[PDB]
């Protein structure tokens, strides 16, 4: 990928698909259900009041 200080830095193409994979991963974990919207924020989560 060369030096990060590439000028102009041209982004590698295969990286944008890795986000859509991660943000669409909907599995179960220790923190309850796990889902991300288009921003990466947690949605459909459950914070328990104690």
Ligand X SMILES: *[C@@H]1O[C@H](CO)[C@@H](O)[C@H](O)[C@H]1NC(C)=O
- The two tokens of residue 28 are 């179960």
User: Any contact of residue 16 with its own copies (CB under 8 A)?
Assistant: yes
User: Any contact of residue 28 with its own copies (CB under 8 A)?
Assistant: no
Residue 33, contacted partner among ligand X, its own copies, none, CB below 5-8 A by kind: ligand X
Q: At its nearest, how many Å lie between its own copies and the CB of residue 30? A: 10
Q: What is the largest CA-CA distance in the chain?
A: 52
Contact 33, 47 (CB under 8 A): no
User: Any contact of residue 27 with its own copies (CB under 8 A)?
Assistant: no
- How far apart are alpha carbons 17 and 2 in whole angstroms? 20
Q: Where do contacts with ligand X occur on this chain (CB under 6 A)?
A: 26, 33, 35, 44
């Amino acid at each position: 990928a060369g030096d990060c200080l590439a000028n102009p830095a041209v982004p590698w193409g295969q990286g944008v698909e890795i986000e859509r994979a991660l943000k669409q991963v909907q599995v179960e974990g220790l923190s309850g259900n796990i889902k991300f919207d288009q921003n990466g924020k947690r949605i459909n989560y459950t914070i328990n009041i104690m």
